[PDB]
Amino acid sequence: YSTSEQLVQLRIACIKLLAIALKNEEFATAQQGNIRIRILAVFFKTMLKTSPEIINTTYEALKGSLAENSKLPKELLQNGLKPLLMNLSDHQKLTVPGLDALSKLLELLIAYFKVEIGRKLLDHLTAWCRVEVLDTLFGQDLAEQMPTKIIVSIINIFHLLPPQADMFLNDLLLKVMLLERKLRLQLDSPFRTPLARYLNRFHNPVTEYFKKNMTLRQLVLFMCNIVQRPEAKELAEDFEKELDNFYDFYI
């Protein structure tokens, strides 16, 4: 815990200077070409470290480092996410930092434009909604438990999933509300702010969905609590042009 702490600080100092050492043109680039590829290899290896205070400055270093474009992604992108999308495959017993790294990585959208991350990871959202998994909650509380933290982290990446069209508008919040009843939890959640992050993204399918299914009092009541929180901004100002349709539907 002394060599561990100083190991962390030394390691992030190194990761700090590799991007600054990439920043000078015709010294980093002109040195044999394939050195900055081989430093992006050590970044993409150090996006599976189990301490967050390395991961945050690897991303904060890498987005400024890769702010200049790279002609890299046909050697290292098969290596840079093989254990990580192996950790996105249904291991079924995932971790907390394995998702926290994935939110930082797949923000950066190249060469994975398929959407089956929500398929296998929605299957994680169904299989962490079994009977025996929710059986161990049942007396001991919310977020501090393990399935609450990993389900919250499962939900908090649909924000940064790419914004092509939702196959995951209906069934996702139907299973979220079905969890809201199957843990009889109301007035707040461990997961509404991640689901508010998902809700602050589309606004054309979801206000139409909030025109279609309006007699469900739990859905309307659920959508009220999302809007009040300051993370929600243009659903807060997007229902405000919809007050004159609510009258016509309910009247």
Side-chain angles (χ1 to χ4, degrees), residues 11-12 14-16 19 40 42-49 51-66 101 104-105 108:
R11 196 172 184 88
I12 62 98
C14 304
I15 290 166
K16 187 180 291 295
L40 291 180
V42 76
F43 291 121
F44 289 163
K45 285 177 67 65
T46 53
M47 262 73 82
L48 52 89
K49 180 58 68 69
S51 68
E53 292 182 353
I54 296 173
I55 300 298
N56 55 2
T57 191
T58 59
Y59 177 69
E60 194 272 333
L62 192 144
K63 69 177 289 184
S65 177
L66 201 62
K104 297 290 184 290
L105 287 175
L108 291 175

Coordinates of all heavy atoms in Angstrom, one line a residue, residues 11-12 14-16 19 40 42-49 51-66 101 104-105 108:
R11 N 3.0 5.3 -12.2 CA 2.4 4.8 -13.5 C 1.6 5.9 -14.2 O 1.7 6.0 -15.4 CB 1.5 3.6 -13.1 CG 1.2 2.7 -14.3 CD 0.5 1.4 -13.8 NE 0.2 0.5 -14.8 CZ 1.0 -0.4 -15.3 NH1 2.2 -0.5 -14.7 NH2 0.7 -1.3 -16.2
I12 N 0.9 6.7 -13.4 CA 0.1 7.8 -14.1 C 1.0 8.9 -14.5 O 0.7 9.7 -15.4 CB -1.0 8.3 -13.2 CG1 -0.5 8.8 -11.9 CG2 -2.0 7.1 -12.9 CD1 -0.4 10.4 -11.8
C14 N 4.0 8.3 -15.9 CA 4.4 7.7 -17.2 C 3.4 7.9 -18.2 O 3.7 8.5 -19.3 CB 4.7 6.2 -17.0 SG 5.9 5.7 -15.8
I15 N 2.2 7.5 -17.9 CA 1.0 7.7 -18.8 C 0.7 9.1 -19.1 O 0.3 9.5 -20.2 CB -0.2 6.9 -18.2 CG1 0.0 5.4 -18.2 CG2 -1.5 7.3 -18.7 CD1 -0.9 4.6 -17.3
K16 N 1.1 10.0 -18.2 CA 1.0 11.5 -18.5 C 2.0 11.9 -19.5 O 1.7 12.6 -20.5 CB 1.2 12.2 -17.2 CG 1.0 13.7 -17.3 CD 1.2 14.5 -16.0 CE 0.2 14.1 -15.0 NZ -1.2 14.6 -15.4
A19 N 1.7 10.9 -23.8 CA 1.0 11.7 -24.7 C 1.7 13.0 -25.0 O 1.7 13.4 -26.2 CB -0.4 12.0 -24.2
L40 N 0.2 3.3 -27.9 CA -1.2 3.1 -27.8 C -1.5 1.6 -27.4 O -2.6 1.4 -26.8 CB -1.9 3.5 -29.1 CG -1.9 5.0 -29.3 CD1 -2.6 5.4 -30.6 CD2 -2.5 5.7 -28.1
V42 N 0.2 0.2 -25.0 CA 0.3 0.1 -23.5 C -0.9 0.9 -22.9 O -1.3 0.6 -21.8 CB 1.7 0.6 -23.0 CG1 1.9 2.1 -23.1 CG2 1.9 0.1 -21.6
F43 N -1.4 1.9 -23.6 CA -2.7 2.5 -23.1 C -3.8 1.5 -23.2 O -4.5 1.2 -22.1 CB -3.0 3.7 -23.9 CG -2.1 4.9 -23.7 CD1 -1.4 5.5 -24.7 CD2 -2.0 5.5 -22.4 CE1 -0.6 6.6 -24.5 CE2 -1.2 6.6 -22.2 CZ -0.5 7.1 -23.2
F44 N -4.0 0.8 -24.3 CA -5.1 -0.2 -24.5 C -4.8 -1.4 -23.6 O -5.8 -2.2 -23.4 CB -5.2 -0.6 -25.9 CG -5.8 0.5 -26.8 CD1 -5.7 0.5 -28.2 CD2 -6.5 1.6 -26.2 CE1 -6.3 1.5 -28.9 CE2 -7.0 2.6 -27.0 CZ -6.9 2.5 -28.4
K45 N -3.6 -1.7 -23.1 CA -3.4 -2.7 -22.1 C -3.8 -2.1 -20.7 O -4.3 -2.8 -19.9 CB -2.0 -3.2 -22.1 CG -1.7 -4.2 -23.2 CD -0.2 -4.5 -23.1 CE 0.1 -5.3 -21.9 NZ -0.6 -6.6 -21.9
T46 N -3.5 -0.8 -20.5 CA -3.8 -0.2 -19.2 C -5.2 0.3 -19.1 O -5.5 1.0 -18.1 CB -2.8 0.8 -18.8 OG1 -2.8 1.8 -19.9 CG2 -1.5 0.2 -18.5
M47 N -6.1 -0.1 -20.0 CA -7.6 0.1 -19.8 C -8.2 -1.2 -19.2 O -9.3 -1.5 -19.6 CB -8.3 0.6 -21.0 CG -8.6 2.0 -20.9 SD -7.1 3.1 -21.2 CE -7.1 3.0 -23.0
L48 N -7.4 -2.0 -18.5 CA -8.0 -3.1 -17.7 C -7.4 -3.1 -16.3 O -7.3 -4.2 -15.7 CB -8.0 -4.4 -18.4 CG -6.7 -5.0 -19.0 CD1 -5.9 -5.9 -18.1 CD2 -7.0 -5.8 -20.3
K49 N -7.0 -2.0 -15.8 CA -6.4 -1.9 -14.4 C -7.6 -1.7 -13.5 O -8.5 -0.9 -13.7 CB -5.4 -0.8 -14.3 CG -4.8 -0.6 -13.0 CD -4.1 -1.8 -12.5 CE -2.9 -2.1 -13.3 NZ -1.8 -1.2 -13.1
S51 N -7.9 -0.1 -10.7 CA -8.0 1.1 -9.9 C -8.5 2.2 -10.8 O -8.0 2.4 -11.9 CB -6.6 1.5 -9.3 OG -5.7 1.9 -10.3
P52 N -9.5 2.9 -10.3 CA -10.1 4.0 -11.2 C -9.2 5.2 -11.4 O -9.2 5.8 -12.5 CB -11.4 4.4 -10.5 CG -11.1 4.1 -9.1 CD -10.2 2.9 -9.1
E53 N -8.4 5.5 -10.4 CA -7.6 6.8 -10.5 C -6.4 6.6 -11.5 O -5.6 7.5 -11.6 CB -7.1 7.2 -9.2 CG -8.3 7.7 -8.3 CD -7.9 8.2 -6.9 OE1 -6.7 8.0 -6.6 OE2 -8.7 8.7 -6.2
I54 N -6.2 5.4 -12.0 CA -5.3 5.3 -13.2 C -6.2 5.4 -14.5 O -5.8 6.2 -15.4 CB -4.6 3.9 -13.2 CG1 -3.6 3.9 -12.1 CG2 -3.8 3.7 -14.5 CD1 -2.9 2.6 -11.9
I55 N -7.4 4.8 -14.5 CA -8.2 4.7 -15.7 C -8.7 6.1 -16.1 O -8.7 6.4 -17.3 CB -9.4 3.8 -15.4 CG1 -8.9 2.4 -15.0 CG2 -10.3 3.7 -16.6 CD1 -8.1 1.7 -16.1
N56 N -9.0 7.0 -15.2 CA -9.5 8.3 -15.5 C -8.4 9.2 -16.2 O -8.7 9.9 -17.1 CB -9.9 9.0 -14.2 CG -8.9 9.1 -13.1 OD1 -7.8 8.6 -13.3 ND2 -9.2 9.6 -12.0
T57 N -7.1 9.1 -15.8 CA -6.1 9.8 -16.5 C -5.5 9.1 -17.7 O -4.8 9.7 -18.5 CB -5.0 10.2 -15.6 OG1 -4.1 11.1 -16.2 CG2 -4.1 9.0 -15.2
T58 N -5.8 7.8 -17.8 CA -5.5 7.2 -19.1 C -6.5 7.6 -20.2 O -6.1 7.9 -21.3 CB -5.6 5.6 -19.0 OG1 -6.9 5.2 -18.6 CG2 -4.5 5.1 -18.1
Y59 N -7.8 7.8 -19.8 CA -8.7 8.4 -20.8 C -8.5 9.8 -21.0 O -8.5 10.3 -22.1 CB -10.2 8.2 -20.3 CG -11.1 8.8 -21.3 CD1 -11.3 8.3 -22.5 CD2 -11.9 9.9 -20.9 CE1 -12.2 8.9 -23.4 CE2 -12.8 10.5 -21.8 CZ -12.9 10.0 -23.1 OH -13.8 10.6 -24.0
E60 N -8.2 10.6 -19.9 CA -8.0 12.0 -20.0 C -6.7 12.3 -20.8 O -6.6 13.3 -21.5 CB -7.9 12.7 -18.7 CG -8.0 14.2 -18.6 CD -6.7 14.9 -18.7 OE1 -5.6 14.2 -18.3 OE2 -6.6 16.0 -19.2
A61 N -5.7 11.4 -20.7 CA -4.5 11.5 -21.5 C -4.8 11.1 -23.0 O -4.3 11.6 -23.9 CB -3.4 10.7 -21.0
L62 N -5.6 10.0 -23.2 CA -5.8 9.4 -24.5 C -6.6 10.3 -25.4 O -6.4 10.3 -26.6 CB -6.2 8.0 -24.4 CG -6.2 7.1 -25.6 CD1 -5.8 5.7 -25.2 CD2 -7.4 7.1 -26.5
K63 N -7.7 10.9 -24.9 CA -8.5 11.7 -25.8 C -7.8 12.9 -26.3 O -8.1 13.3 -27.4 CB -9.9 12.1 -25.1 CG -9.8 13.1 -24.0 CD -11.2 13.4 -23.4 CE -11.9 14.2 -24.4 NZ -13.3 14.6 -23.9
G64 N -6.9 13.5 -25.5 CA -6.1 14.6 -26.1 C -5.0 14.0 -26.9 O -4.5 14.6 -27.9
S65 N -4.5 12.8 -26.6 CA -3.5 12.1 -27.4 C -4.1 11.7 -28.8 O -3.5 11.9 -29.8 CB -2.9 10.9 -26.7 OG -2.0 10.2 -27.5
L66 N -5.3 11.1 -28.8 CA -5.9 10.7 -30.0 C -6.8 11.8 -30.6 O -7.6 11.5 -31.5 CB -6.7 9.4 -29.8 CG -7.1 8.4 -30.9 CD1 -5.8 7.9 -31.5 CD2 -7.9 7.3 -30.3
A101 N -14.5 0.8 -17.5 CA -13.6 1.0 -18.6 C -14.4 1.0 -19.9 O -13.9 1.7 -20.8 CB -12.6 -0.2 -18.6
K104 N -15.7 4.4 -20.9 CA -14.7 5.2 -21.4 C -14.2 4.8 -22.8 O -14.0 5.7 -23.7 CB -13.5 5.2 -20.5 CG -13.8 5.8 -19.1 CD -14.0 7.3 -19.1 CE -14.2 7.9 -17.8 NZ -15.5 7.4 -17.2
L105 N -14.2 3.5 -23.1 CA -13.7 3.1 -24.4 C -14.7 3.3 -25.5 O -14.4 4.1 -26.4 CB -13.3 1.6 -24.3 CG -12.0 1.3 -23.6 CD1 -11.9 -0.2 -23.5 CD2 -10.8 1.9 -24.3
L108 N -15.6 6.1 -27.9 CA -14.8 6.4 -29.1 C -15.2 5.4 -30.2 O -14.8 4.3 -30.2 CB -13.3 6.3 -28.7 CG -12.9 7.4 -27.8 CD1 -11.5 7.2 -27.4 CD2 -13.1 8.8 -28.5

